[PDB]
Design an enzyme around this catalytic site. Structure first.
Site, PDB file in Angstrom:
ATOM      1  N   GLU A   1      76.021  84.012  33.808  1.00 39.59           N
ATOM      2  CA  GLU A   1      75.980  85.402  34.204  1.00 39.59           C
ATOM      3  C   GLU A   1      77.021  85.625  35.284  1.00 39.59           C
ATOM      4  O   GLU A   1      77.509  84.673  35.899  1.00 39.59           O
ATOM      5  CB  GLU A   1      74.591  85.762  34.715  1.00 39.59           C
ATOM      6  CG  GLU A   1      74.416  87.244  35.002  1.00 39.59           C
ATOM      7  CD  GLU A   1      73.001  87.612  35.380  1.00 39.59           C
ATOM      8  OE1 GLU A   1      72.395  86.875  36.188  1.00 39.59           O
ATOM      9  OE2 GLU A   1      72.506  88.649  34.880  1.00 39.59           O
ATOM     10  N   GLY A   2      77.385  86.883  35.488  1.00 45.80           N
ATOM     11  CA  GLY A   2      78.287  87.247  36.564  1.00 45.80           C
ATOM     12  C   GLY A   2      78.162  88.698  36.972  1.00 45.80           C
ATOM     13  O   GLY A   2      77.281  89.440  36.513  1.00 45.80           O
ATOM     14  N   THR A   3      79.062  89.094  37.853  1.00 47.09           N
ATOM     15  CA  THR A   3      79.180  90.475  38.256  1.00 47.09           C
ATOM     16  C   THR A   3      79.703  91.283  37.085  1.00 47.09           C
ATOM     17  O   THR A   3      79.285  92.416  36.861  1.00 47.09           O
ATOM     18  CB  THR A   3      80.167  90.585  39.414  1.00 47.09           C
ATOM     19  OG1 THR A   3      81.337  89.813  39.101  1.00 47.09           O
ATOM     20  CG2 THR A   3      79.538  90.051  40.689  1.00 47.09           C
ATOM     21  N   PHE A   4      80.623  90.679  36.343  1.00 47.36           N
ATOM     22  CA  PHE A   4      81.253  91.322  35.194  1.00 47.36           C
ATOM     23  C   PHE A   4      80.301  91.519  34.023  1.00 47.36           C
ATOM     24  O   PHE A   4      80.513  92.398  33.197  1.00 47.36           O
ATOM     25  CB  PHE A   4      82.413  90.472  34.705  1.00 47.36           C
ATOM     26  CG  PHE A   4      81.983  89.155  34.154  1.00 47.36           C
ATOM     27  CD1 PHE A   4      82.076  88.022  34.922  1.00 47.36           C
ATOM     28  CD2 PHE A   4      81.448  89.059  32.874  1.00 47.36           C
ATOM     29  CE1 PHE A   4      81.684  86.801  34.426  1.00 47.36           C
ATOM     30  CE2 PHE A   4      81.043  87.843  32.372  1.00 47.36           C
ATOM     31  CZ  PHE A   4      81.165  86.710  33.152  1.00 47.36           C
TER      32      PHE A   4
ATOM     33  N   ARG B   1      78.023  88.902  31.231  1.00 45.84           N
ATOM     34  CA  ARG B   1      77.472  87.628  30.755  1.00 45.84           C
ATOM     35  C   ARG B   1      78.455  86.844  29.891  1.00 45.84           C
ATOM     36  O   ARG B   1      79.350  87.419  29.271  1.00 45.84           O
ATOM     37  CB  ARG B   1      76.186  87.890  29.963  1.00 45.84           C
ATOM     38  CG  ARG B   1      74.927  87.890  30.819  1.00 45.84           C
ATOM     39  CD  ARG B   1      73.829  88.774  30.253  1.00 45.84           C
ATOM     40  NE  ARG B   1      72.720  88.876  31.196  1.00 45.84           N
ATOM     41  CZ  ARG B   1      71.721  89.749  31.108  1.00 45.84           C
ATOM     42  NH1 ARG B   1      71.668  90.622  30.109  1.00 45.84           N
ATOM     43  NH2 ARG B   1      70.763  89.753  32.031  1.00 45.84           N
ATOM     44  N   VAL B   2      78.286  85.529  29.856  1.00 41.18           N
ATOM     45  CA  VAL B   2      79.006  84.701  28.889  1.00 41.18           C
ATOM     46  C   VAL B   2      78.005  83.962  28.003  1.00 41.18           C
ATOM     47  O   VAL B   2      77.197  83.159  28.497  1.00 41.18           O
ATOM     48  CB  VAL B   2      79.937  83.678  29.563  1.00 41.18           C
ATOM     49  CG1 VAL B   2      80.535  82.736  28.529  1.00 41.18           C
ATOM     50  CG2 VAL B   2      81.037  84.389  30.318  1.00 41.18           C
TER      51      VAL B   2
ATOM     52  N   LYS C   1      82.708  86.225  26.504  1.00 40.33           N
ATOM     53  CA  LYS C   1      82.524  87.037  27.691  1.00 40.33           C
ATOM     54  C   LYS C   1      82.165  88.454  27.280  1.00 40.33           C
ATOM     55  O   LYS C   1      82.906  89.112  26.585  1.00 40.33           O
ATOM     56  CB  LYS C   1      83.800  87.025  28.526  1.00 40.33           C
ATOM     57  CG  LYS C   1      83.674  87.700  29.878  1.00 40.33           C
ATOM     58  CD  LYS C   1      84.979  87.578  30.639  1.00 40.33           C
ATOM     59  CE  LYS C   1      84.813  87.822  32.128  1.00 40.33           C
ATOM     60  NZ  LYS C   1      85.971  87.238  32.855  1.00 40.33           N
TER      61      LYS C   1
ATOM     62  N   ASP D   1      92.152  84.085  42.601  1.00 43.42           N
ATOM     63  CA  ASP D   1      90.723  83.807  42.720  1.00 43.42           C
ATOM     64  C   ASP D   1      90.371  82.435  42.182  1.00 43.42           C
ATOM     65  O   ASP D   1      89.359  82.261  41.510  1.00 43.42           O
ATOM     66  CB  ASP D   1      89.906  84.896  42.017  1.00 43.42           C
ATOM     67  CG  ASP D   1      88.438  84.860  42.389  1.00 43.42           C
ATOM     68  OD1 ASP D   1      88.096  84.216  43.405  1.00 43.42           O
ATOM     69  OD2 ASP D   1      87.638  85.488  41.667  1.00 43.42           O
TER      70      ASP D   1
HETATM   71  C1  LIG Z   1      80.033  76.138  29.530  1.00 46.25           C
HETATM   72  N1  LIG Z   1      81.033  76.542  28.515  1.00 46.25           N
HETATM   73  C2  LIG Z   1      81.964  77.536  28.800  1.00 46.25           C
HETATM   74  N2  LIG Z   1      81.592  78.403  29.716  1.00 46.25           N
HETATM   75  C3  LIG Z   1      82.381  79.383  30.096  1.00 46.25           C
HETATM   76  N3  LIG Z   1      81.853  80.189  31.059  1.00 46.25           N
HETATM   77  C4  LIG Z   1      80.817  79.633  31.937  1.00 46.25           C
HETATM   78  C5  LIG Z   1      80.435  80.768  32.840  1.00 46.25           C
HETATM   79  N4  LIG Z   1      81.239  81.828  32.925  1.00 46.25           N
HETATM   80  C6  LIG Z   1      80.951  82.858  33.711  1.00 46.25           C
HETATM   81  C7  LIG Z   1      79.770  82.828  34.445  1.00 46.25           C
HETATM   82  C8  LIG Z   1      78.964  81.700  34.323  1.00 46.25           C
HETATM   83  N5  LIG Z   1      79.316  80.693  33.524  1.00 46.25           N
HETATM   84  C9  LIG Z   1      83.656  79.540  29.508  1.00 46.25           C
HETATM   85  C10 LIG Z   1      84.801  80.473  29.641  1.00 46.25           C
HETATM   86  C11 LIG Z   1      84.972  81.594  30.610  1.00 46.25           C
HETATM   87  C12 LIG Z   1      85.657  82.795  30.352  1.00 46.25           C
HETATM   88  C13 LIG Z   1      85.776  83.742  31.337  1.00 46.25           C
HETATM   89  C14 LIG Z   1      85.252  83.536  32.645  1.00 46.25           C
HETATM   90  N6  LIG Z   1      85.348  84.452  33.636  1.00 46.25           N
HETATM   91  C15 LIG Z   1      84.849  84.264  34.851  1.00 46.25           C
HETATM   92  C16 LIG Z   1      84.200  83.068  35.169  1.00 46.25           C
HETATM   93  C17 LIG Z   1      84.062  82.084  34.219  1.00 46.25           C
HETATM   94  C18 LIG Z   1      84.594  82.316  32.925  1.00 46.25           C
HETATM   95  C19 LIG Z   1      84.492  81.366  31.896  1.00 46.25           C
HETATM   96  C20 LIG Z   1      85.728  80.023  28.755  1.00 46.25           C
HETATM   97  N7  LIG Z   1      85.270  78.924  28.073  1.00 46.25           N
HETATM   98  C21 LIG Z   1      84.015  78.596  28.509  1.00 46.25           C
HETATM   99  N8  LIG Z   1      83.143  77.621  28.182  1.00 46.25           N
END
Ligand SMILES: CNc1nc(NCc2ncccn2)c2c(-c3ccc4ncccc4c3)c[nH]c2n1
EC number: 2.7.12.1
Length: 347
Positions: free
Chosen positions: A35-38, A40-41, A57, A154
């Site tokens: 989850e995030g401010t933006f 969910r993923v 995302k 960031d």
């Molecule tokens: C565990 N596998 C995995 N997870 C991901 N995200 C985990 C996550 N993201 C956000 C919040 C909490 N957790 C990604 C992303 C991706 C794309 C955009 C993002 N934007 C901001 C922060 C992170 C981000 C991560 C690309 N491949 C991934 N694979």
């Protein structure tokens, strides 16, 4: 995990969805990865490419984050253009689209963040060989962005994900405890919603607090070198397992910098418009307040963080120092950084 925490926690903008749902007759949701401010993923199955897994995302329906995403997309477009072979070490976009009003973006599935792994390992620091590899890829990945007139803005361990965060278990007889250790230290860099081109508008305030560079705090205008500050903070964090600048207050942050790195140079002190923080050419900070004692008690001169006295450890801190140079103009560039002794062993 999607429990309402409060009366203020309505599904405000949040997309209504359940595991199993299909998006565009193609992407089947399997799990919520974060989850995030933006928004969910979520993890999805790409049925149009033989069941490969992807990360998707999903942006809220709020104008602030919609625009951030728009910018994120077009950066990633620009990125896949300049490198259609995807050896850059930034994350790979595949696709993007509207669904029920919410923007969605499709990235390769990666592991846990370098943060998460670390946190899930009780902040047990990374061993130096892994610190070197992670630092190297980190610098490569970002050099790429700098070469193409981009600043991330960031960087932090949350935005550096392992390709594969599979890990070996090793119990410690020498110290009594459980200790993880990741198999593959290959990583990629994520989150380009904040990333900025030289000609585009620059937000006044930019990095996540702990990773924020002095030029930003002092509002002297920033660019490529503030990424480097952050990288230094990250590399330090990997080596010791905790945050270099654990504060939430500009004055305090400036204090910590001074304590850790030495005094802030005068050019910066005269040339800032944030003169509230200074007095007669020094930081307007009393060391004997409880804040003052906290700072002195809970951080110390950079080189007092060295554990071993092997040459390779000294090269690390040489690198970190050069990266945490107060003046962006004098601060090490990633080009210069990749050539550093510490990394000689690679290339
Ligand atoms: C565990 N596998 C995995 N997870 C991901 N995200 C985990 C996550 N993201 C956000 C919040 C909490 N957790 C990604 C992303 C991706 C794309 C955009 C993002 N934007 C901001 C922060 C992170 C981000 C991560 C690309 N491949 C991934 N694979």
């Amino acid at each position: 995990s999607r429990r309402a925490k409060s009366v203020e926690d309505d599904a405000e903008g949040h997309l209504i969805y359940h595991v199993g749902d299909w998006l565009q007759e193609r992407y089947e949701i399997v799990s919520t990865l974060g989850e995030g401010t933006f928004g969910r993923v979520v993890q999805c199955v790409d049925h149009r490419r033989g069941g490969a897994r992807v990360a998707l995302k999903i942006i809220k329906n709020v104008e602030k984050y919609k625009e951030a995403a728009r910018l994120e997309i077009n950066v990633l477009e620009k990125i896949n253009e300049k490198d259609p072979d995807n050896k850059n070490l930034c994350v790979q976009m595949f696709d993007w689209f509207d669904y029920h009003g919410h923007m969605c973006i499709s990235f390769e599935l990666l592991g846990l963040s370098t943060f998460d792994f670390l946190k899930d390992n009780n902040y047990l620091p990374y061993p130096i060989h892994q610190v070197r590899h992670m630092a190297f890829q980190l610098c490569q990945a970002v050099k790429f962005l700098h070469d193409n007139k981009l600043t991330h803005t960031d960087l932090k361990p949350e935005n550096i994900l392992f390709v594969n965060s599979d890990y070996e278990l090793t119990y410690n007889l020498e110290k009594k405890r459980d200790e993880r250790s990741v198999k593959s230290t290959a990583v990629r860099v994520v989150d380009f919603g904040s990333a900025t081109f030289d000609h585009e508008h620059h937000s006044t305030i930019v990095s996540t607090r702990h990773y924020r560079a002095p030029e930003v705090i002092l509002e002297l205008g920033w660019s490529q070198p503030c990424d480097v500050w952050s990288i230094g903070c990250i590399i330090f964090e990997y080596y010791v397992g905790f945050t270099l600048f654990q504060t939430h207050d500009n004055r305090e942050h400036l204090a910590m910098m001074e304590r850790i790195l030495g005094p802030i140079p005068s050019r910066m002190i005269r040339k800032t418009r944030k003169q509230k923080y200074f007095y007669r050419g020094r930081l307007d900070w009393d060391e004997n307040t409880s804040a003052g004692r906290y700072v002195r008690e809970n951080c110390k001169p950079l080189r007092r963080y060295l554990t071993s006295e092997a040459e390779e450890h000294h090269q690390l801190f040489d690198l970190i120092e050069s990266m945490l140079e107060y003046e962006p103009a004098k601060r090490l560039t990633l080009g210069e950084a990749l050539q550093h002794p510490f990394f000689a062993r690679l290339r």
